Amino acid sequence: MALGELKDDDFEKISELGAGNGGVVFKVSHKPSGLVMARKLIHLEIKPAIRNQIIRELQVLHECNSPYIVGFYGAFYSDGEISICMEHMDGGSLDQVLKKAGRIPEQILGKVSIAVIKGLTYLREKHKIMHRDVKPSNILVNSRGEIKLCDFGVSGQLIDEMANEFVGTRSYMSPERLQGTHYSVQSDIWSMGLSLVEMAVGRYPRPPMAIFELLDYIVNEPPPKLPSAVFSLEFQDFVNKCLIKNPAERADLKQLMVHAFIKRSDAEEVDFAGWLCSTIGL
Ligand SMILES: Nc1ncnc2c1ncn2[C@@H]1O[C@H](COP(=O)(O)OP(=O)(O)CP(=O)(O)O)[C@@H](O)[C@H]1O
Ligand SMILES: NCC1(O)CN(C(=O)c2ccc(F)c(F)c2Nc2ccc(I)cc2F)C1
Ligand SMILES: [Mg+2]
């Protein structure tokens, strides 16, 4: 195989890229091959049987080949930590982008939407993987203006081991999934919807309120909306279609791929690489 034997000593740290909900991310050098990578270290306390079942499940990522999906190099265990090794995105994520930008403009978000719709389609049609955690920190970008999905639930055991340590981004869960309902394809679309609204307006799109209240609000109250004067009705409509509370009525990826917002967006000439670089100092 291309790399075959990944181990801690090969890798040399260039920078920490930061920490999330159970992992820390480094920009590495892979000394032997000359590859620049992102290496996510997820600390767990697990049997060596389950630690090897996770690593074997992860190897399915070798098969994920898409310009809309962050590329995988390998997965290994060393000194208390599972390593996921992946293509390095020099734009970081949209959540980082949003913190620097304040608000991400609708035209860039039409381009975000397309890549996401296409990433999710690929994962589902090729590999039968739902993402399970769509949110701006898991949408990555680079100086070539590429936009890619990371952190999707490839390994059912890493899912399992992840869940029964941490609660996660319950703020991103669909009403149905908060009511207990098992994960659905229709849940990734809800979260795509909410992600776009949040990047559009510059902040998590619900009234502020203690966490437990939020969860009941989501199931009980109606879904978020864009403000109607400062966004196109195309973008408005697109967003509302992803955020129907009934999963039977929510739009699917197919229907979303042909929406007027997307048709419009695709034909636009947006220099997102240029924007990103003036924006974040690349
Ligand atoms: N392939 C990659 N290239 C560059 N930066 C990356 C990267 N993957 C992750 N990062 C950055 O590292 C940081 C940590 O990622 P991580 O997935 O740990 O947390 P997060 O910020 O997405 C919350 P969560 O843990 O729920 O996903 C994030 O800022 C992310 O943007
Ligand atoms: N906060 C919860 C999360 O958002 C779920 N996270 C993961 O890192 C993750 C979880 C399950 C899984 F199978 C992975 F492969 C995961 N990682 C993963 C999946 C695909 C790629 I490419 C790169 C990756 F690191 C963080
Ligand atoms: Mg993440």
DSSP class of residue 62 equals: G
Q: How far is the CA of 42 from the centre of ligand 2 (A)?
A: 9
User: DSSP label at 71?
Assistant: P
From residue 37, alpha-carbon distances to 5, 71, 197, 265 in Å are 15, 10, 31, 31
Pairing, β 11-19 against β 35-43: unpaired
Render the burial of 213-250: b for 16+ CB within 10 Å, e for the rest: ebbeebeeeebbebeeeebeebbbebbbbbbbeebeeb
- For the Cβ of 25 lying below 6 angstroms from any atom of ligand 2, the answer is no
DSSP per position, 117-143? HHHHHHHHHHH----S--SGGGEEE-T
State the Cα angle at 246 between 121 and 184, rounded to 5°: 40
Which residues, in sequence order, are CB contacts of 208 under 8 Å at separation 6+?
Answer: none
Element (H, E) at 76: strand 72-78
3-state SS, residue 18: strand
138: CA distance to ligand 1 center in Å? 6
Measured between alpha carbons, how far is 25 from 19 in angstroms, rounded to an integer?
Answer: 6
Q: Which atom of ligand 1 is nearest to the CA of 89?
A: 3
Query: CB burial class (10 A; 0-12, 13-18, 19+) of residue 147?
Result: buried
Ligand 2: residue whose CA is nearest its atom 20: 151
Which residue has a Cα nearest atom 19 of ligand 1?
20
Quote the CA–CA distance of 260 and 237 in Å, as a whole number. 9
Residue spans of alpha helices (H) in the chain? 48-58, 94-101, 106-127, 156-163, 175-178, 185-201, 211-220, 233-242, 253-257, 260-267, 272-280
Residue 18 pairs with which residues in a beta bridge? 25
Alpha carbons 76 and 78: distance in angstroms, whole number: 7
Give the DSSP letter string of 167-209: ---GGGS-HHHHTT----HHHHHHHHHHHHHHHHHTS-SS---
Give the residue ranges of the annotated binding site for U0126. Answer: 40, 151-154
The approach used to solve this structure was X-ray
Tokens for 23, please give them. 């992992």
Q: Which ligand is nearest to the CA of 140?
A: 1
DSSP three-state, residue 107: helix
Out of 85, 149, 151, mutate this one to test ligand 2's pocket (max ligand atoms within 8 Å of CB): namely 151
Helix (H) / strand (E) containing 5: none
Report all structural domains of the chain as residue ranges with CATH numbers, in order of start. Answer: 1-89 (3.30.200.20), 90-282 (1.10.510.10)
Q: Which residue ranges have their beta carbon within 6 Å of ligand 1?
A: 17-23, 25, 38, 40, 70, 86, 88-89, 92-93, 96, 137-138, 140, 150-151, 169
Distance 24 CA to ligand 1 centre (A): 8
